Specification:
Number of strands of chain B: 10
PDB class: oxidoreductase
CATH superfamily of the largest domain in chain D: NADH-ubiquinone oxidoreductase 51kDa subunit
Organism of A: Thermus thermophilus
Shape of chain D: globular
Helix content of chain B: 10-25%
Chain A: NADH-quinone oxidoreductase subunit 2
Structural class of chain D: alpha/beta
Largest sheet of chain D: 5 strands, mixed
Oligomer: part of a larger assembly
Distance between the termini of chain B: 35 Å
Number of helices of chain D: 16
Number of domains of chain B: 1
Number of domains of chain D: 4
Strand content of chain B: 5-15%
Keywords: oxidoreductase, electron transport, respiratory chain
Strand order of the largest sheet of chain D: 6-5-9-7-8
Entry title: Crystal structure of the hydrophilic domain of respiratory complex I from Thermus thermophilus, oxidized, 4 mol/ASU, re-refined to 3.15 angstrom resolution
Bound molecules: flavin mononucleotide, iron/sulfur cluster, FE2/S2 (inorganic) cluster, calcium ion
Strand content of chain D: 5-15%
Shape of chain B: globular
Structural class of chain B: alpha+beta
Helix content of chain D: 40-55%
Distance between the termini of chain D: 45 Å
Radius of gyration of chain D: 22 Å
CATH class of the largest domain in chain D: Alpha Beta
Chain lengths: ~180, ~240, ~130, ~425
């Protein structure tokens, strides 16, 4: 996998000392994610030799974190906030609806193959709740029932997220509700 | 050398000594799960709790006797109700998700969990005593799944001392085992299948419980039933 | 309720699906453990559909990729559970009258299960 | 006026979030056009390393990571002149529920951060710093990298800053979602390439942190506050706040209120002021407010609470504690149990799994109780046990996470025990009001 982009290893290994090659484990794992949708046992075997340690050690390290997936994820992996602040904004009703609709459990992937789901923790934008993070990019903030069907229908039409019109207005570091 | 008062006994003891080893040296006792002869102490399971005074001024929070060093003129209480009550609870927590295998479990009466359970557990307060508070579904996972032809691993039993994984990186230097996910869900696992290092057998002798077991001698006799014969291995010069 | 009885009945089923998928796609099914509240049941009665409590669909090396279990008869907050080891995915299936076996609001049908099993087998089996 | 700054004063000067939300606020040019790294320059050329410590020890700055430790003092522990490589680390793993102040400082005014770490770097003899940002903060990550490159170019970073014989570079390490990575000692292991477990603190980070070398760790807000402190004297900083809570704090409020979000304010301004003047007051009736982080014990919605000074002392001796200053209001329309049900299930999911007390205690016993009692499957007995578990855990774990899971529960019982006994005694689940539009 990383045989290809040698210029990437080069650069990231550079960020850390000669002895702490292990440091690279996180960012390497990271790439394999944003590229392939999920991390394969092979990738770990690789990253292992690559970073100078055992496949076991790298497995333990990878299975620790929440972002990395280890089973295939849809094109658009909706991660929903469920922590308190978003709960008082309706976070559960959203999750019920989003699931009930798509008919997918967390482990699964929609028939059409583009939607996985997963509850996550507080994403540090409580003021703009409820919040959804899509893949590895900017929060689709203030998911109202309406706004949601808009984010959904938008991706469902192939439209690249970073330019989908989201009905209603939603603030920056301060937000007005009406 | 340092002056340390355990409970009622006073003992001399080198400077970089463990409060734990202090206690045992004085001839006392404390629940011991994760620390081990020759392995790095970390205060993992939290059994070897004690109370400490150091001037008498009583430290606010209980300490992990296995990772706190001794200091000159230190009192170490290992009998206070406050202490027993704490060990009692810690034991309760350890047993909270365990699997109920004993009669069937190959760890026989040579199991650190049982012994300490009986030794310190079930706190006497001062009516029908309550053996178990936790009435929910226990943690169920993988079971009796052999890592190699010589070691059979039972994940359910494991108590998450760090003994085995810690041993591997330290003694042999062959990291072929380590916890997987996190929280109540973590477990011991591998990706180096044969258990490579020529020194894997030792994890069987360290594992406080019946998770890591000698498969070479699975289901032969219970541990007391055996006739022990101390001797010397003469396969090689050591 | 007597919905408890129906849950175990369904758990018997969930197991039958597992054994099916097992011999079907050529991969090992294994009873991981039997109910303690059966083993150490003595003169005491027992009218549960099976003894089997924890089961797995393991791979070539034995490493499980699917893990199912139901809660013992004497426990509280009963649920039948699915777990894809190594991949932080946990499913709690309950039972609703008339609707059936559900993971929340969504039904857990032989179809949906078999789907989950595959996703796991293909991506998570070591051998 | 006459004496001391504590809120909506006219002599209050916004510093940190001054430029946040202003079009093009991250450009190196936008920072210099507004008096950029000109403070970093002065300090490096004139004042000595130790001297800059004393100005911060003098300022009264306390760790804005929620900690609350005197940051001047903190740097005072770093080794003098020993020749070892020293590391500085920015704890941008902001992930404690209800807290989102550090996000926008990264997203919009990164150069402020960089300048801060330069100062702080020089202060502790750190030739290299790392910034650990949670892997959910996409924008902040993208922005930081950019800014670090710009600054690396025009010579504000690296080789030999400002002609002065001090060098300083930054690297950005993205995390991957795990609350625990925010414990300083855990952060080091995560970044260092290991499983994210907190370390044995008998051997401290100050003398052995990142790869064994003497490192120091400060929060985004802390390091950013270092810039205005070095600019307008420590005395300017100190003319703000209470007797032990000096400076300006970035408070943030969330939950059912008119306009939530971040509000820069002088340490000590009243909850009322924040909840009402800036945030524009609740939209529901409120019953309790979580003062600092999530890890802070809830307080009841009483007059005397609203009129309390948000400080590292007034909240202290009031039962709770000021964490990250990230308030969360809770409506009477949602059961207090339902709220803790949630918070604990968070810590339960977020535990690392080193401790028995936490791995099994909170993540095993505790969470399940709430489930029982919160489906009206609980009896009076259950409550009493959840009650008893607390003191068995709080005391001794390995890291403060468990403490964080038990306090807010402990606290909730202290002020709402009745709410728990209700759902139990009456076998009613928690209420499910409709909460989203
Ligand atoms: C369990 C635990 C979790 C923490 N999580 C965070 C966090 O998410 N974000 C953060 O900024 N600090 C967090 N901290 C605080 C770190 O200890 C903190 O960044 C460090 O003490 C800050 O230094 P400072 O307060 O001088 O800035 C956490 C601490 C603990 C013990
Ligand atoms: S590890 Fe010990 S306590 Fe556990 S079932 Fe086995 S013999 Fe019993
Ligand atoms: S397998 Fe045994 S030695 Fe290893 S962590 Fe589990 S209890 Fe400890
Ligand atoms: S208190 Fe919890 S999160 Fe902290 S070290 Fe212990 S098990 Fe890990
Ligand atoms: S609670 Fe959802 S972002 Fe903080
Ligand atoms: S033995 Fe000291 S805590 Fe485990
Ligand atoms: Ca090249
Ligand atoms: Ca197996």
């Amino acid at each position: 996998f990383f045989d290809d982009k040698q210029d990437f290893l080069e650069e990231t290994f550079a960020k850390y000392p000669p002895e702490g090659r292990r440091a690279a484990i996180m960012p390497l794992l990271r790439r394999v994610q944003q590229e392939e949708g999920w991390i394969r046992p092979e990738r770990i075997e690789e990253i292992a030799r690559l970073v100078g340690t055992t496949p076991t050690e790298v497995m333990g390290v990878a299975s620790f974190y929440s972002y990395y997936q280890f089973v295939p994820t849809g094109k658009y992996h909706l991660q929903v906030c469920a922590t308190l602040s978003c709960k008082l904004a309706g976070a559960e009703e959203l999750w019920d609806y989003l699931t009930e609709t798509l008919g997918i459990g967390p482990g699964e992937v929609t028939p059409d193959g583009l939607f996985s789901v997963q509850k996550v923790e507080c994403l540090g934008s409580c003021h703009t709740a409820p919040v959804i993070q899509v893949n590895d990019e900017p929060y689709v903030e203030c998911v109202t029932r309406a706004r949601l069907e808009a984010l959904l229908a938008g991706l469902r039409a192939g439209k690249r997220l970073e330019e989908i019109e989201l009905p209603g207005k939603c603030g920056h570091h301060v937000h007005e509700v009406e | 050398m340092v002056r340390v008062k355990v409970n009622d006994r006073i003992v001399e003891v080198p400077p970089g000594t463990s409060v734990m080893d202090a206690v045992f040296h004085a001839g006392y006792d404390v629940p011991l799960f994760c620390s081990e002869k020759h392995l790095s102490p970390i205060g993992a399971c939290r059994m070897c709790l004690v109370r400490i005074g150091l001037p008498i001024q009583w430290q606010p929070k209980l300490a992990a006797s296995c990772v706190t060093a001794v200091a000159d003129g230190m009192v170490v209480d290992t009998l206070s109700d406050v202490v027993r009550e704490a060990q009692a609870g810690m034991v309760e927590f350890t047993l909270l998700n365990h699997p109920l295998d004993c009669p069937t479990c190959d760890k026989g009466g040579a199991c650190e969990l049982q012994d300490r359970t009986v030794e310190y557990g079930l706190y006497e307060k001062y009516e029908l005593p309550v053996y178990t508070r936790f009435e929910f579904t226990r943690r169920h996972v993988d079971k009796h799944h052999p890592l190699s032809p010589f070691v059979i691993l039972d994940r359910e039993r494991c108590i998450h001392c760090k003994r085995c994984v810690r041993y591997f990186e330290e003694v042999p230097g062959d990291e072929v085992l380590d916890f997987i996910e996190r929280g109540v869900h973590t477990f011991i696992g591998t990706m180096d299948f044969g258990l490579p290092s020529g020194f894997s057998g030792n994890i069987t002798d360290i594992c406080p419980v019946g998770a890591l077991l000698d498969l070479t001698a699975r289901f032969r006799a219970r541990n007391w039933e055996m006739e022990e014969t101390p001797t010397t291995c003469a396969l090689c010069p050591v | 309720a007597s919905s408890e009885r129906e849950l175990y009945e369904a758990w018997v089923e969930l197991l039958s699906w597992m054994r099916e998928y097992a011999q079907a796609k050529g991969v090992r099914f294994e009873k991981e453990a039997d109910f303690p509240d059966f083993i150490y049941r003595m003169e005491r009665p027992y009218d549960l559909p099976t003894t089997i409590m924890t089961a797995s669909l393991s791979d070539g090396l034995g490493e499980p990729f699917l893990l199912a279990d139901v809660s013992p008869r004497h426990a509280k907050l009963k649920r039948i559970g699915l777990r894809l080891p190594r991949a932080h995915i946990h499913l709690h299936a309950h039972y609703e009258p008339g609707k059936g076996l559900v993971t929340g609001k969504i039904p857990l049908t032989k179809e949906r299960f078999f789907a989950l099993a595959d996703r796991a087998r293909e991506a998570l089996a070591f051998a | 006026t006459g004496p001391i700054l504590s809120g909506l004063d006219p002599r209050f000067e916004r510093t940190l979030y001054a430029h946040v939300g202003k079009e093009g606020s991250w450009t190196l040019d936008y920072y210099l056009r507004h008096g950029g790294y000109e403070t970093a320059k002065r300090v490096l050329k004139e004042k000595t390393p130790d001297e800059v410590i004393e100005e911060v020890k003098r300022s009264g700055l306390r760790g804005r990571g929620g900690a609350g430790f005197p940051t001047g003092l903190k740097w005072s522990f770093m080794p003098k002149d020993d020749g070892k490589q020293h590391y500085l680390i920015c704890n941008a793993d902001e992930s404690e529920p209800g807290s989102f102040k550090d996000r926008y400082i990264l997203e919009d005014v990164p150069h402020l951060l960089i300048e801060g770490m330069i100062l702080a770097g020089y202060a502790i003899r750190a030739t290299v710093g790392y910034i650990y940002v949670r892997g959910e903060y996409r924008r902040a990550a993208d922005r930081l990298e950019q800014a670090i490159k710009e600054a690396r170019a025009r010579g504000y970073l690296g080789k030999n800053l400002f002609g002065t014989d001090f060098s300083f570079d930054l690297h950005v390490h993205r995390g991957a979602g795990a609350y625990i990575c925010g414990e300083e000692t855990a952060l080091m292991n995560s970044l260092e390439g290991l499983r994210a477990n907190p370390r044995l603190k008998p051997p401290f980070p100050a003398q052995s942190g990142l790869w064994g070398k003497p490192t120091t760790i400060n929060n985004v807000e802390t390091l950013a506050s270092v810039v205005p402190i070095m600019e307008r004297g420590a005395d300017w900083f100190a003319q703000m706040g209470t007797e032990q809570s000096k400076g300006m704090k970035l408070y943030q409020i969330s939950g059912p209120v008119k306009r939530p979000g971040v509000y820069e304010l002088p340490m000590g301004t009243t909850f009322r002021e924040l909840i009402y003047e800036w945030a524009g007051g609740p939209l529901e009736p409120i019953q309790a407010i979580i003062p600092g982080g999530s890890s802070t014990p809830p307080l009841p919605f009483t007059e005397e609470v609203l009129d309390t000074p948000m400080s590292y002392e007034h909240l202290q001796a009031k039962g709770s504690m000021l964490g990250t200053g990230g308030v969360i209001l809770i409506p009477e329309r949602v059961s207090m149990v339902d709220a803790m049900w949630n918070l604990t299930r968070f810590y339960a999911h977020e535990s690392c799994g080193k401790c028995t007390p936490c791995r099994e205690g909170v993540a095993g016993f505790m969470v399940n109780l709430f489930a029982k009692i919160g489906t009206g499957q609980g009896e009076e007995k259950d409550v009493e046990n959840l009650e008893a578990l607390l003191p068995l855990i709080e005391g001794r774990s390995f890291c403060p996470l468990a403490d964080a899971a038990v306090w807010p529960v402990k606290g909730s019982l202290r002020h709402f025990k009745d709410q728990y006994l209700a759902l139990a005694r009456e076998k009613r689940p928690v209420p499910r009001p409709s909460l989203w539009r």
